[PDB]
Amino acid sequence: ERGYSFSLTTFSPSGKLVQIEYALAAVAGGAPSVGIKAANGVVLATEKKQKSILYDERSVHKVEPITKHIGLVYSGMGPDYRVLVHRARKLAQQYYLVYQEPIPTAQLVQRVASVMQEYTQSGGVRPFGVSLLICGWNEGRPYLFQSDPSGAYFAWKATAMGKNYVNGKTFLEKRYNEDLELEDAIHTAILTLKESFEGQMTEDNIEVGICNEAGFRRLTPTEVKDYLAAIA
Amino acid sequence: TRSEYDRGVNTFSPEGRLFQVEYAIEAIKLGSTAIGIQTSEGVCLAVEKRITSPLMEPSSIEKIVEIDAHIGCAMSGLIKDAKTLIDKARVETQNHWFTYNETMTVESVTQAVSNLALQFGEEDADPGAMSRPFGVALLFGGVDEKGPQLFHMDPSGTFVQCDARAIGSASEGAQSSLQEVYHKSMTLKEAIKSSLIILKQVMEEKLNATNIELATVQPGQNFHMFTKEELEEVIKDI
Amino acid sequence: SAGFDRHITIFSPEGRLYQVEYAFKAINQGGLTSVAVRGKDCAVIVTQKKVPDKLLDSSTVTHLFKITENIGCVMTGMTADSRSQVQRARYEAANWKYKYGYEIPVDMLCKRIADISQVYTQNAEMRPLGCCMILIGIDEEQGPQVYKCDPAGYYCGFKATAAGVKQTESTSFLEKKVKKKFDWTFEQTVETAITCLSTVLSIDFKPSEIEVGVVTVENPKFRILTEAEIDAHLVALAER
Amino acid sequence: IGTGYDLSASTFSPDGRVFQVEYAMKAVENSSTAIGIRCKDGVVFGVEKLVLSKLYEEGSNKRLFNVDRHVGMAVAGLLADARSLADIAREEASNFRSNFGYNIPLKHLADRVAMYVHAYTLYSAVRPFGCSFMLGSYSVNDGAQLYMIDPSGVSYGYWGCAIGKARQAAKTEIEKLQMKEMTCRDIVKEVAKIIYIVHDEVKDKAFELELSWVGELTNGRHEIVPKDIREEAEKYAKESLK
Amino acid sequence: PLLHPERFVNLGIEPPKGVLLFGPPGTGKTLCARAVANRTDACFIRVI
Amino acid sequence: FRNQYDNDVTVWSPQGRIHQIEYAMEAVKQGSATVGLKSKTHAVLVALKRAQSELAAHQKKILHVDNHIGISIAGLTADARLLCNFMRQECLDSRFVFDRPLPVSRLVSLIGSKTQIPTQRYGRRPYGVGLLIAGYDDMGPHIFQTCPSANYFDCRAMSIGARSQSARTYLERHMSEFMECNLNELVKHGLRALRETLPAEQDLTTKNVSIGIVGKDLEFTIYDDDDVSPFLEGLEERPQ
Amino acid sequence: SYDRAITVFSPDGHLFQVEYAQEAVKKGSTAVGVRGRDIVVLGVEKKSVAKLQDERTVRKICALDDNVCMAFAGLTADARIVINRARVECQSHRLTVEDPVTVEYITRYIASLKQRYTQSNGRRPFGISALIVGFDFDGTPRLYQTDPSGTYHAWKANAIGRGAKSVREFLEKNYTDEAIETDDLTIKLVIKALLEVVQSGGKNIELAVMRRDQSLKILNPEEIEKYVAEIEKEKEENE
Amino acid sequence: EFPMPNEEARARIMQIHSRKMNVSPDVNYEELARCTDDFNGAQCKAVCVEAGMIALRRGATELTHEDYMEGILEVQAKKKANLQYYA
């Protein structure tokens, strides 16, 4: 089994590619992130905690928009997340140029899944050590997707990956209901961040973005502080 | 520990040897015995068929082929390797008959074929070519402006003018016998008789019409492969 | 468990990229140290200088450089990787100026060069340039910025950062200074950097052993603090 | 010993060091010794060349090349490596002249050649240039500079440095020489005695000394020491080496 | 040495003191040794 | 196996050697000996022809590339032949573009540049052929020996190949006449050199020797059994 | 060692990957072809479809051109690929020279294709042996065997796949000049050779006959029962 | 540090190992030394006592320079490869 956990183009005699599983293990060790799809919108959040407050939290953002209504969060490697954001922006804008219409999020997830599974096609190039959470609103429907280092993509009413993802998933399945409202969705997301935050979230310790009929927008620090106070 | 240098042709032994090329050389001994002899009246090429089954079509198994009407060939090694070599040789001879509109000398024939050979470790294989040394030893004979000429080609690309060379499984023994059986004034008929004598002494079975392919090239006629009746005539004496 | 530390493109169990950490440790191999401190409208970079002999030309052994006329740079690690990375950074900044018609912001320069290093560490055709970077500059509506880049392609802004053999202790000292919440004026920023270096090294260095660069709002040009002004600054620190 | 890490140049060490460039360091230190000194109005070069066999002609394996008209080329390491590095440096200088229309500064040429030699250090399908070379020039409007660039890729500025089996030895006896003031006339003597004392006679005997310099004494043009000054330097050596 | 001692006597060289006949099995080592024993006019010793 | 450092040219030994290059260097020690001498105005290449069997011709060791420049090979047939076609193409290109013969020093420099690429870059095997280069240019005859380590030397003489140390020490005994000798004298010196290489039981027969001579007015002409006959008639007898 | 490398000679001068690909044919299925005076026949053992396989798409015998046919033994995907390539090449040859492709040309093309697929790494050899049959312009019966090594050979009646040695010996012992006097005699020989290894008879055998440019029709499963009735009749006739 | 044997090192080494030999003064140890390039140490045993045994091969002659040059040429490489495909 060890001789097959070294390349991405050799099948293990029993199962499948082991490098993909190791990339997934890299993903599961990343920063926790939770996305929740409410009835009228979607919310995705993550923890930005890092030692050495010397670090400029505003310098980098874990939640970025792809277009006016598509946003994404990750869990795992940072630079790979940035590269995925770049490729996703290029693909979405190519779709916009070809069709002159805002890119449906399902097609965006499919294309980003294809581009990341492209890195899994041959040896010499490691698969992305990053899993994506895609939030989007279109045709009067909020969409939430997860993109995998393996190139697999699936939908999610509400999920959470990264560190302590099993406990967060249990919390979500013990909290989420199909008739959830946007503000209550944000409350549930911040609570999910909390139950394994380990160190008293501040306004800048976490980062949360929201998408709805009015497009996608990452919440400003003031609204984050207000929501944190409301939850307390 | 040789094992680290046999893997691949681009490795050098501590004794500076090309082990892949040496293995290709030894792979010639897997082929059937081929004997060519050079005489003033011409060159004759004798080979063993090694027929696997009586149902075989003897025309299919080719140990001697024609590159041009003035030149002849003999093979020992892989069938497909020699097929590419012979096709390239024929293409080259027509290339010369195009460029200079003349019959191109056998030494230049082996020159061009050896140019196709020894190209295994060459970066020009990017379109596609041998990543491995060619695995057939070639016996070239014919008549040119220097009279009858016979050249033996080494899968490494080396060639040498040989009065009488033997390649194949019994190259060592046949060469040893040719060493004392060869004379410079040997006539074509007695040379071919001696060649079949060596084959009889060397070949694993009896000599019949289906055990030997025979070829001759003389300044007078063009390349002639001995027919069934000619083979019977030349073998009934022996 | 182990044995996966041979190729940059191989994921170990638990999804740990050994060779990248190997490069991060290679950053330290230079044997030097460097720190960057930022004020309200200034950003001071100071680095140590070790000279085996007088036989070398001290004017060419500078460890801090200038990416563009207002963007300065300091870095450590392998010096060959250092000069290759500064060449690439200057190339990228010039290309940005050519294509977009205005000077590269520090954050975007760090982002692009970190993307380059990420592509280096993503494919197995490249040794991932084992030298860390610190970039400084001034930007309108945001003020001075100090950014750090590493061979992994991880980039982040810093109120204060450090690198070299004494990374952890320098960062701890930086945290100890920044938790006091003081304005850090330009001379104060420079003196904090010098004190950090001297204490983490415990050498109380002569002024000839440090190179300093500073960028301010009134002097957007990346000024390499000359011997006269570094002498003034650090001997004033001595008496102050 | 690092086994399993030094089969390629793109693999780091657990201590974080590429062992290929360190092995190139080792090869350079197992090579011949070459000294250079920059005078007040130019730079001079000196090569200790071992005549492995008297069958070799004099001037064989010439080691003090000249990359440009105003730029010399001293180098220690592998002669094939030396020639390849010299050729790429010459092409670089020619390209600089073709594109920019004036002489290449020594510092800029050193930066370009260091970048190129680094480009062979960090790949896996190639190997770092295991040879250390010298760059020397004299410009009337720029000055005089000297640079040593080893296979590690670091191009640092040295007033006058040495590379070879007597690196530290030549450092010890070139430190005692005062340098910055006298010109080539009073520096060639020191170079000659230094080269003739660093060489070991009991082991690795049979060496000859060749010299070259650039400066206004030949109008900023690099050339070998003239035969008259060459024999004068040899005479000062034999007098001073006693 | 056995049949011509005088040449190593007047060459002042000690005759060979020991020899190792190392080779793969079945090569003939035993048989060559026995043959040389017969032709050296000395009795062969077999020590299994 | 501690010799995992000799499987490709692109890895160094821990002691700083490329063992593959050294094996390529030793490879040409296998081929037959070949010694060259040069006069005031004439350079000779004399080689010991070898045959696979006495019933076949001897392997040519003196190759003509251009009227003024000639080469002698000792080592792999393939590499030497490829180098010969490369030499012929370059000499023709020089004659076509400059209308002047390729300088011996320049030819050997381009030979070194061509053969260094296999030594430096993964892929092509190092050119394991020892080449003896003898030509004529403005400053007279030259003898260049290109060792398969991609190195070359300007030599008064050189013997490369099997048991070439005997010829080397012969020439080491006999410098004092090489410079002032005429055609016949230098030819007989070279023949004595090969005879020193050749053991007792063998002698320099007509089929055994190959002689190539170049000079100021005499082109690089190679002699054979009938052509070497006048030159060996002046040859003395072996001092046995 | 020396086995896991397509283009590395063994110390005893063997390209072991090529021989392993050749041996991979012996794990296929028996396919015997005989050429007669005016006919060529192809006898192949048919895998008995369990309950659901559509026999229309389990094609073991396929015709490259209207003048050539072929049966294969080896991996079916490789056979399909080589079939597509070889019939494309037959059509392109007719484009270049306008005359029907001779059996020698198409067999040479197939051998050269297999060879160029077994001379470089990253390209696995075509592990299939194909029996090429057909008539030339002058209607001469020719049959060729192609070997995964990239070589071809002219066979009067050859068998490939599992049990090919037994069929080979059977043909050696039974191939006569008078055994090909009539089409029915050639058929009797080929069904006899088939039932040598596939003794069940009836089904599990497919036959194809090419006469002098009839654009061969595979013998349909109505006269295979008739032809095997004839075979059994002659079989109880001599015994 | 044990370096490569020097020419004098050789000369004296075959002198001491051959001190038991009846070597005539017609030899020249120094020229052997200068042809002992890369011949080191235990390679006495080869050149040295194998030269005694070559004098036996030569026909039990005096230990003259002929067998010493012969041993130098042979040493470990006494086997002749006689290899084809080399020009």
Ligand SMILES: Nc1ncnc2c1ncn2[C@@H]1O[C@H](COP(=O)(O)OP(=O)(O)O)[C@@H](O)[C@H]1O
């Ligand atoms: N050179 C040889 N000449 C004759 N017979 C030999 C030779 N080599 C091996 N044999 C045969 O091999 C057989 C066994 O050899 P043996 O001496 O037992 O091998 P080993 O050297 O391993 O002891 C003997 O019967 C002998 O006939």
